[PDB]
Enzyme design. Structure first.
Site, short mmCIF file in Angstrom:
data_model
loop_
_atom_site.label_atom_id
_atom_site.label_comp_id
_atom_site.label_asym_id
_atom_site.label_seq_id
_atom_site.Cartn_x
_atom_site.Cartn_y
_atom_site.Cartn_z
N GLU A 229 1.46 5.61 1.65
CA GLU A 229 1.83 5.21 0.27
C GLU A 229 2.90 6.08 -0.39
OE1 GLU A 229 -1.73 5.52 -1.84
OE2 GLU A 229 -2.79 3.88 -0.81
N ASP A 278 1.10 1.40 3.78
CA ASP A 278 1.36 1.22 2.35
C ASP A 278 0.79 -0.10 1.82
OD1 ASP A 278 2.38 1.87 -0.18
OD2 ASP A 278 4.32 2.50 0.64
N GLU A 349 -5.85 -2.72 5.90
CA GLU A 349 -6.89 -2.56 4.89
C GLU A 349 -7.31 -3.86 4.19
OE1 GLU A 349 -5.98 0.81 2.38
OE2 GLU A 349 -5.39 2.03 4.04
#
Length: 450
Positions: A229, A278, A349
């Site tokens: 990120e 990210d 994710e």
């Protein structure tokens, strides 16, 4: 004489055939085929509900019913099928998710200290369903180190909780996705203070941290997110200047640290596929920034080590924390953008809020154990399930470059965003419509390919 099925669930009704119908020719009909359809072999699928769905799922789960009838000769028999948004089937009672998708990509999920007893896995559903596990928490920097010795430079590691987790998963034949080495949050005060350091000093400390961690886990980790990120948004024009200043490696070393990080990692554990990870990559601006960084670092790596086969940043994990407002088309565009890089891709994710971001933020906000406060409606939950199916078909369509689809949890109750009911299983570890739709994307995809 009746049965209840979660929407998306199919059930073989052959066992409820009367004994005296044996040996005969069976014919199957539904009173409401749009609500529940039945095959000529007697498999019923729950499709839709009748009424609610503007209604809050937590108040009044929506239902529907069809009478399904088996006929042989002049005699028949009827079973009332109740369709419902609510989960019925226990996670452990379902066939492995990884098996269904094994020809396409690894099916992953996450786990925690809680999930291991001693050195062994303390529940069977994780190894049953998933081929690779990302530790949700215990590999974050703050959980791996708590100090640095100011006089010698010696970094103090706490590896034991993560070691137990890694070794447990491996014993069950599961791979591991390491997460993450370099971040702007959840880092130890000694790493935060690195924000005030000199470029040359910081570079050596950063390289040391990376090397030592990966050496401890050498050969055991399928893939690592080396860096997490790093872009605040997609506003920036220029990746070298766009990165998060609150990342202590960025502030101290400047933009060079990215290339140096991945290079340290490759030298430490060549067995590991190196990833950048990210969220909001469905936002073309942010995705532009990411593709540019990855292009330039990998060009630099090429200029530096011209005989080398491998990429430096080998993969791009798309966190895929999505919600009702995210179109598959935006995701598909980003994938086309990353396809030009030659990288591997992961859905790293994946979860999907049953509402828009603002509604989630406006109601529960973040954190676990909030599922019993959700404002999700019944329609929301079927809408979620459609979205899982639509995304998965897109990932299947891209499964040459996508090696992994991992979701950011098992049950909605323990989801980091539980207030949004974002996962495949409900608070009781029962299959949601989303589970069924998730699985069904393979059937749908292959049905298109023939």
């Amino acid at each position: 004489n009746e049965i209840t099925l979660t929407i998306g669930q199919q059930k073989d009704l052959a066992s409820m055939v009367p004994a005296k119908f044996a040996g005969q020719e069976l014919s199957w009909t539904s009173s409401d085929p749009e609500t529940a359809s039945v095959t000529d072999k007697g498999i019923v699928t729950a499709l839709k509900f009748s009424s609610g769905g503007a209604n809050l799922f937590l108040k009044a789960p929506a239902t529907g019913e069809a009478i399904i009838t088996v006929t042989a000769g002049k005699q028949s028999h009827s079973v009332k099928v109740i369709t419902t948004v609510k989960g019925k089937e226990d996670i452990e009672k379902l066939p492995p998710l990884k098996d269904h998708f094994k020809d396409y990509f690894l099916i992953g999920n996450i786990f925690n200290n809680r999930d291991v007893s001693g050195s062994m896995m303390d529940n069977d559903w994780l190894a049953h369903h998933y081929a690779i596990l990302t530790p949700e928490n215990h590999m974050k920097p703050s959980n791996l180190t708590n100090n640095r010795n100011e006089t010698t430079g010696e970094i103090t590691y706490t590896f034991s909780t993560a070691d137990r987790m890694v070794n447990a998963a491996i014993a069950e034949g599961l791979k591991i996705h390491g997460h993450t080495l370099l971040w702007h949050q959840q880092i130890p005060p000694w790493q935060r203070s690195m924000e005030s350091a000199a470029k040359d000093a910081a570079l050596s400390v950063m390289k040391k941290y990376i090397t030592e961690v990966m050496t401890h886990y050498k050969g055991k980790i399928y893939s690592w997110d080396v860096l997490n990120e790093i872009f605040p948004d997609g506003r920036g024009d220029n990746w070298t200047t766009a990165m998060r200043p609150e990342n202590p490696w960025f502030k101290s070393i400047g933009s060079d640290f990215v290339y140096e990080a991945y290079l340290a990692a490759r030298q430490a554990d060549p067995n590991a596929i190196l990833y950048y990870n990210d969220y909001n990559m469905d936002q073309a601006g942010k995705a532009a920034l990411i593709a540019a960084m990855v292009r330039d670092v990998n060009a630099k790596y090429k200029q530096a080590y011209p005989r080398e086969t491998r990429l430096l940043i080998e993969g791009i994990g798309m966190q895929s924390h999505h919600n009702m407002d995210v179109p598959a088309s935006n995701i598909r565009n980003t994938i086309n953008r990353y396809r030009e890089l030659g990288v591997k891709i992961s859905v790293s994710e994946l979860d999907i809020l049953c509402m828009g971001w603002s509604a989630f933020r406006g109601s529960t906000g973040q954190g676990a154990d909030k599922d019993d406060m959700t404002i999700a409606t019944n329609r929301n939950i079927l809408d979620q399930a459609y979205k899982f199916n639509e995304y998965m078909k897109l990932y299947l369509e891209n499964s040459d470059i996508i090696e992994r689809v991992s979701m950011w949890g098992v049950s909605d109750r323990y989801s980091w965003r539980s207030g949004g009911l974002p996962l495949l299983f409900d608070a009781d570890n029962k299959a949601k419509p989303a589970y069924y739709s998730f699985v069904r994307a393979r059937e749908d995809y292959e049905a298109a390919k023939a």
